[PDB]
Design a protein around this ligand. Structure first.
Ligand SMILES: *[C@@H]1O[C@H](CO)[C@@H](O[C@@H]2O[C@H](CO)[C@@H](O[C@@H]3O[C@H](CO[C@H]4O[C@H](CO[C@H]5O[C@H](CO)[C@@H](O)[C@H](O)[C@@H]5O)[C@@H](O)[C@H](O)[C@@H]4O)[C@@H](O)[C@H](O[C@H]4O[C@H](CO)[C@@H](O)[C@H](O)[C@@H]4O[C@H]4O[C@H](CO)[C@@H](O)[C@H](O)[C@@H]4O)[C@@H]3O)[C@H](O)[C@H]2NC(C)=O)[C@H](O)[C@H]1NC(C)=O
Ligand SMILES: *[C@@H]1O[C@H](CO)[C@@H](O[C@@H]2O[C@H](CO)[C@@H](O[C@@H]3O[C@H](CO[C@H]4O[C@H](CO)[C@@H](O)[C@H](O)[C@@H]4O)[C@@H](O)[C@H](O)[C@@H]3O)[C@H](O)[C@H]2NC(C)=O)[C@H](O)[C@H]1NC(C)=O
Ligand SMILES: *[C@@H]1O[C@H](CO)[C@@H](O[C@@H]2O[C@H](CO)[C@@H](O[C@@H]3O[C@H](CO)[C@@H](O)[C@H](O)[C@@H]3O)[C@H](O)[C@H]2NC(C)=O)[C@H](O)[C@H]1NC(C)=O
Ligand SMILES: *[C@@H]1O[C@H](CO)[C@@H](O[C@@H]2O[C@H](CO)[C@@H](O[C@@H]3O[C@H](CO)[C@@H](O)[C@H](O)[C@@H]3O)[C@H](O)[C@H]2NC(C)=O)[C@H](O)[C@H]1NC(C)=O
Ligand SMILES: *[C@@H]1O[C@H](CO)[C@@H](O[C@@H]2O[C@H](CO)[C@@H](O)[C@H](O)[C@H]2NC(C)=O)[C@H](O)[C@H]1NC(C)=O
Ligand SMILES: *[C@@H]1O[C@H](CO)[C@@H](O[C@@H]2O[C@H](CO)[C@@H](O)[C@H](O)[C@H]2NC(C)=O)[C@H](O)[C@H]1NC(C)=O
Ligand SMILES: *[C@@H]1O[C@H](CO)[C@@H](O[C@@H]2O[C@H](CO)[C@@H](O)[C@H](O)[C@H]2NC(C)=O)[C@H](O)[C@H]1NC(C)=O
Ligand SMILES: *[C@@H]1O[C@H](CO)[C@@H](O[C@@H]2O[C@H](CO)[C@@H](O)[C@H](O)[C@H]2NC(C)=O)[C@H](O)[C@H]1NC(C)=O
Ligand SMILES: *[C@@H]1O[C@H](CO)[C@@H](O[C@@H]2O[C@H](CO)[C@@H](O)[C@H](O)[C@H]2NC(C)=O)[C@H](O)[C@H]1NC(C)=O
Ligand SMILES: *[C@@H]1O[C@H](CO)[C@@H](O[C@@H]2O[C@H](CO)[C@@H](O)[C@H](O)[C@H]2NC(C)=O)[C@H](O)[C@H]1NC(C)=O
Ligand SMILES: *[C@@H]1O[C@H](CO)[C@@H](O[C@@H]2O[C@H](CO)[C@@H](O)[C@H](O)[C@H]2NC(C)=O)[C@H](O)[C@H]1NC(C)=O
Ligand SMILES: *[C@@H]1O[C@H](CO)[C@@H](O[C@@H]2O[C@H](CO)[C@@H](O)[C@H](O)[C@H]2NC(C)=O)[C@H](O)[C@H]1NC(C)=O
Ligand SMILES: *[C@@H]1O[C@H](CO)[C@@H](O[C@@H]2O[C@H](CO)[C@@H](O)[C@H](O)[C@H]2NC(C)=O)[C@H](O)[C@H]1NC(C)=O
Ligand SMILES: *[C@@H]1O[C@H](CO)[C@@H](O[C@@H]2O[C@H](CO)[C@@H](O)[C@H](O)[C@H]2NC(C)=O)[C@H](O)[C@H]1NC(C)=O
Ligand SMILES: *[C@@H]1O[C@H](CO)[C@@H](O)[C@H](O)[C@H]1NC(C)=O
Ligand SMILES: *[C@@H]1O[C@H](CO)[C@@H](O)[C@H](O)[C@H]1NC(C)=O
Ligand SMILES: *[C@@H]1O[C@H](CO)[C@@H](O)[C@H](O)[C@H]1NC(C)=O
Ligand SMILES: *[C@@H]1O[C@H](CO)[C@@H](O)[C@H](O)[C@H]1NC(C)=O
Ligand SMILES: *[C@@H]1O[C@H](CO)[C@@H](O)[C@H](O)[C@H]1NC(C)=O
Lengths: 118, 434, 118, 118
């Protein structure tokens, strides 16, 4: 767990399974522990729901439509998957999450399911 | 450059977070008869062989002063004390005029008082005796008419006679989805990037030791004395000094005490200080002079690196015993020891100590607790592991601090940080859905 | 959200993303709120479990086997997906939900999975 | 439910939908019941997460890679799916469950997702 946190993003893909797997008295102390159980569940489900709508429910690595912007990143894939680590990547692409998620969520769900019925 | 969005799940990244940690205890050595307050018997045993994982090439920024683990620990400690004291007998029936004379501390501080108390049948009263320490008794009149010290402000609750308050190291562990990071930098002060950071399942056990001027029974600095302060130029801040060597302190209650069990109602029992057997002697603590001086020479030497001034130490300046003395619990007894001979040959420094039974813990005035007497004699051995100092020219003056209990755990929790896992993110690939 | 509630069922197929997406002290006040959170999770999961058993876990629109009955509906698809709204549809097919769900769960689960192993 | 518990494992494969489907005041009595509800949810999710990582999220019967050992079983499939019941089977493979699960979680997650991106 987190052994690859400081490593190459590409290499770190080999730990996605563990990183995902470990996500899961009438006193004040007791109620706080119950709250903890519940919030852990809610956090888990929100991520699963999002993967679900994106069509990535069965995948740890999910290829989707929507190309990359230069306004998001102007680096080659050679830095991204070889020289840069996930913490560093997150530091730069954290400002685009509200752009990318929306682009996938609507466009790639509605266009895709309509074509599938048809 | 035909790069498409890829969704990743299980990405090993995190953000700072504030969550609820849980109690864990490595020791299950104690039974359910000892009733230690921290023996919650609700919390999980620790993993006897916990896994520490070194994260290479990471640089986590730690901050002990803004650390939320300290506040959480503080809150839970207060809660456990109230939960265990709540069900026991109130001593409000004893808030009566006391008739007192001195004990035969003759050829001082212990009073012999009589009471008129309610017996199990409401129409009858009984005359009873108990001894009290002067610190718990306040004169009403100019005559020998006294009251218990807190009856004019609040209720007094008797500590449960069978509950132990001896510290058990408590481990604080994160809930799933969260992780605890720790800094392994030997010279690390309260804030800054740590170049050697590991992740743990949870913290080591920290004993909830209560003290004021001196920090007892904690951990040691590994290489040198490390002085940690939120703002080193602000005299109002507590300066926490962690020693790299412990100093033994030997404390005792030399009197042979006895206990009188007094009924004050229908199953309402009060434990009074009973007769004194043998000599009447003063409580005290023993600190070797040579170890003390060596230690203080090194503390000033290290402090000088921040001030480039002459450094002297002075006795506490004044106020209530809770601040002016080395207040600590040992064996269930509450000691208030004088430190004037420390903060100021080859003998042992003997510090006189005072003892009191009615305690307002953590400045919560009006939540007074009565500590019942312990029979026999008390012997304590403790380790001084640190100091709390404040500041008042070409010379700097340091004096003993304390009072705010938060500083006592901050001094141990400076090594840990809580973060949460955020497993989703995106990056460019040459693979597109179709 | 619900913008198409009064609109044509067919057109409303483009709003399923939002409809599907926004489903996620020791005092009595506090326990009631915790109970509400637990219920929301339970309701969410029951719907997901049902889509799961039906083989519709990855879909907002899932085509299954089992033809329509005249006893369930006697209208053409031209009225149903052009003139009718989802509220109106629900008003007509409300008495057949148990029938349809039962048929799908047994038939399209066991026959299909057995054939796939074979 | 459990009607086939004492029956042939093969035949019992036809009852999996029910076995899966039925998995889903400020007083002490009340908190105990709330605690129970939360725990039931956690159990459900843990099984789903495991099926998910194994690539069996949409299946009741899931064919995977990794062969059988002689240490696991020395019986032919003819005994296993004809004369043996699920309780009897569980009695024999009970000590190999951790082993099998680990073999699936790593090998069949990594080889398959890596090849799919490529
Ligand atoms: C910093 O760290 C240090 C180091 O840990 C702390 O120092 C320790 O503090 C402990 C608590 O104050 C203290 O423990 C007491 O020691 C007394 C004397 O010890 C002698 O006798 C024991 C006998 O041990 C055997 O019997 C006990 C009985 O339970 C068993 O538990 C043991 O496993 C053994 O089987 C020897 O082992 C010692 O070597 C000495 O010879 C004890 O009397 C005292 O026990 C009583 O109080 C307990 C409080 O919880 C209670 O649980 C226990 O059952 C006893 O109480 C019963 O008996 C009395 C008898 O009158 C009766 O009145 C009661 O009503 C009840 O029936 C503790 O064991 C450690 O000795 C001490 N360590 C050192 C080196 O001194 C330090 O406190 C800490 N500092 C701070 C500030 O936190
Ligand atoms: C504080 O004062 C207490 C009261 O004086 C001390 O308790 C006394 O300690 C002495 C130690 O010598 C005991 O004397 C021994 O007693 C045993 C027999 O004990 C049993 O029988 C007696 C009969 O009364 C009974 O009271 C006890 O509970 C036992 O059932 C003898 O065999 C020895 O030879 C010797 O006489 C006293 O008996 C004991 N008194 C009581 C009431 O317990 C206490 O030790 C003092 N504490 C300190 C730290 O000094
Ligand atoms: C710890 O013990 C020391 C002594 O061992 C205490 O110091 C003493 O404190 C008293 C306070 O009343 C001083 O008395 C006052 O002295 C001044 C001197 O001018 C006098 O004007 C006052 O009228 C009064 O007599 C006493 O002198 C002082 N002793 C020494 C040697 O300085 C100390 O207060 C104790 N501290 C704690 C926290 O218990
Ligand atoms: C105050 O600090 C000193 C120094 O760290 C403490 O002394 C150390 O106490 C530990 C207790 O576990 C000793 O560990 C064990 O000692 C036994 C001796 O037979 C050994 O068999 C075990 O394998 C283990 O080493 C440690 O050796 C001892 N250190 C020295 C130099 O003696 C002292 O106990 C602390 N006092 C308090 C009140 O905490
Ligand atoms: C931290 O960075 C160092 C330096 O890049 C990593 O060490 C390299 O590991 C690869 C693994 O194949 C070797 O081929 C390189 O030769 C190593 N470099 C050196 C200078 O020895 C190290 O693995 C990184 N750790 C993490 C967690 O990323
Ligand atoms: C960085 O911190 C780690 C601990 O997280 C240190 O690793 C320990 O080193 C000691 C040396 O004797 C070993 O006994 C421990 O078993 C090691 N622990 C782990 C988890 O591997 C490491 O040495 C520190 N490195 C530096 C440069 O300080
Ligand atoms: C209790 O109060 C009485 C007086 O209110 C104290 O003084 C005693 O008064 C009686 C009256 O008959 C005398 O016989 C005693 O000799 C008096 N005692 C002394 C020492 O002179 C008494 O001291 C008070 N103290 C206690 C603890 O009861
Ligand atoms: C309550 O305490 C007072 C003393 O503080 C008791 O008053 C004394 O009682 C004795 C009993 O005979 C009298 O001889 C004294 O003269 C009384 N003192 C005074 C000043 O009059 C009082 O009796 C106690 N009440 C109970 C119920 O014991
Ligand atoms: C009721 O409690 C208050 C404190 O909350 C007492 O006021 C102070 O008590 C301390 C105790 O030593 C004295 O030193 C102070 O001088 C008192 N204040 C003042 C202004 O004198 C108050 O006196 C208590 N009531 C009674 C009757 O003693
Ligand atoms: C330990 O304290 C020293 C200061 O005595 C820190 O050094 C930095 O000093 C500069 C001076 O301008 C400040 O601006 C920096 O902000 C200080 N660093 C930090 C983190 O505040 C030193 O960095 C501290 N320890 C660590 C672990 O960095
Ligand atoms: C410690 O805090 C003090 C103030 O709490 C900082 O110094 C002063 O900051 C105030 C802020 O308004 C200024 O107005 C004063 O002029 C400052 N003092 C001086 C002498 O300039 C101080 O810098 C902080 N020090 C550290 C080490 O953090
Ligand atoms: C505190 O008590 C301990 C325990 O008795 C003292 O340790 C003893 O010190 C003497 C001094 O030479 C040694 O001979 C003994 O062997 C030590 N005993 C043990 C068990 O180690 C310690 O010195 C006392 N501290 C003070 C300040 O007096
Ligand atoms: C409510 O009904 C009206 C008509 O009954 C809808 O208005 C129609 O909107 C479509 C959109 O393409 C137009 O082509 C039609 O010409 C409109 N009809 C009329 C009479 O103007 C309206 O959109 C409906 N609103 C909802 C929520 O269903
Ligand atoms: C319990 O075992 C008996 C036989 O051991 C099962 O009965 C068999 O049912 C099949 C159904 O096709 C028949 O073809 C066999 O001829 C029956 N055997 C006999 C001896 O009559 C029975 O169904 C089993 N029940 C369960 C729950 O497994
Ligand atoms: C990049 O961002 C701009 C912002 O206006 C947008 O117009 C453009 O289409 C985006 N390109 C990609 C690849 O998303
Ligand atoms: C820290 O402890 C070691 C133990 O040998 C000692 O040599 C060193 O001088 C101490 N440093 C300080 C500042 O006390
Ligand atoms: C303690 O304080 C007194 C104050 O007069 C001083 O005279 C004495 O020398 C001091 N002792 C030490 C060790 O500094
Ligand atoms: C329609 O209902 C009848 C009632 O018996 C049933 O027999 C027939 O199979 C049903 N048709 C469909 C499509 O289910
Ligand atoms: C069977 O067990 C042996 C024991 O080590 C192991 O080496 C072999 O790979 C196992 N076969 C399977 C299918 O796991």
């Amino acid at each position: 767990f987190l052994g690859a946190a400081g490593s190459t993003m590409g290499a770190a893909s080999m730990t996605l399974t563990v990183q995902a797997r470990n996500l899961l008295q009438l006193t004040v102390w007791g109620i706080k522990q119950l709250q903890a159980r519940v919030l852990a569940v809610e956090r888990y489900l929100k991520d699963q729901q999002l993967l679900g709508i994106w069509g990535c429910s069965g995948k740890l690595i999910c290829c989707t439509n929507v190309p990359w912007n230069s306004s998001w990143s102007n680096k080659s894939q050679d830095e991204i998957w070889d020289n840069m680590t996930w913490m560093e990547w997150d530091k730069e692409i954290n400002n685009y999450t509200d752009i990318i998620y929306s682009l996938i969520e609507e466009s790639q769900n509605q266009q895709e399911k309509n074509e599938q019925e048809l | 450059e035909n790069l498409w969005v890829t969704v990743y799940y299980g990405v090993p990244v995190w953000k700072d977070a504030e969550t609820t940690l849980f109690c864990a205890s490595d020791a299950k050595a104690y039974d359910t008869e000892k009733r230690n307050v921290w023996a919650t018997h609700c919390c999980v045993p620790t993993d006897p062989n916990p896994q520490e994982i070194v994260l290479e090439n990471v640089t986590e920024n730690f901050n002990m002063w803004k650390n939320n683990m300290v506040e959480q620990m503080h809150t839970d400690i207060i809660s456990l004390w109230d939960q265990s004291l709540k069900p026991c007998v109130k001593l409000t029936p004893l808030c009566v005029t006391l008739n007192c004379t001195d004990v035969n501390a003759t050829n001082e501080e212990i009073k012999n008082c009589s009471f008129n108390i309610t017996t199990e049948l409401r129409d009858k009263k009984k005359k009873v005796y108990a001894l009290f320490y002067k610190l718990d008794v306040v004169p009403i009149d100019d005559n020998n008419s006294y009251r218990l010290i807190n009856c004019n402000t609040s209720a007094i609750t008797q500590a449960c006679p069978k509950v132990s308050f001896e510290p058990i190291p408590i481990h604080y562990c994160a809930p799933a989805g969260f992780a605890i990071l720790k800094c392994n930098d030997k010279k690390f002060n309260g804030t800054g990037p740590c170049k050697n950071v590991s992740t743990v399942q949870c913290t080591h056990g920290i004993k909830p030791v209560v003290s004021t001027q001196l920090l007892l029974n904690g951990s040691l600095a590994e290489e040198e004395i490390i002085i940690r302060s939120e703002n080193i130029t602000n005299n109002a801040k507590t300066i926490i000094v962690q020693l790299n060597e412990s100093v033994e302190i030997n404390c005792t209650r030399p009197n042979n005490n006895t206990r009188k069990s007094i009924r004050i109602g229908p199953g309402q029992w009060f434990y009074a200080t009973g007769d004194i057997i043998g000599d009447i002697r003063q409580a005290h603590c023993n600190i070797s002079r040579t170890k003390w001086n060596k230690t203080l020479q090194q503390v000033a030497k290290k402090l000088r690196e921040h001030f480039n001034k002459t450094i002297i130490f002075n006795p506490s300046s004044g106020g209530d015993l809770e601040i002016t003395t080395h207040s600590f619990n040992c064996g269930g007894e509450f000691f208030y020891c004088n430190t004037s001979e420390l903060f100021n040959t080859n003998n042992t420094i003997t510090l006189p100590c005072r003892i009191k039974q009615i305690i307002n813990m953590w400045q919560r005035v009006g939540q007074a607790m009565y500590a019942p007497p312990i029979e026999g004699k008390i012997r304590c051995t403790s380790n001084i592991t640190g100091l709390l100092l404040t500041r008042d020219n070409n010379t700097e003056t340091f004096r003993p601090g304390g009072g705010d209990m938060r500083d006592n755990w901050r001094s141990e929790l400076y090594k840990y940080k809580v973060v949460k896992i955020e497993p989703l993110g995106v990056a460019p690939t040459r693979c597109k859905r179709r």
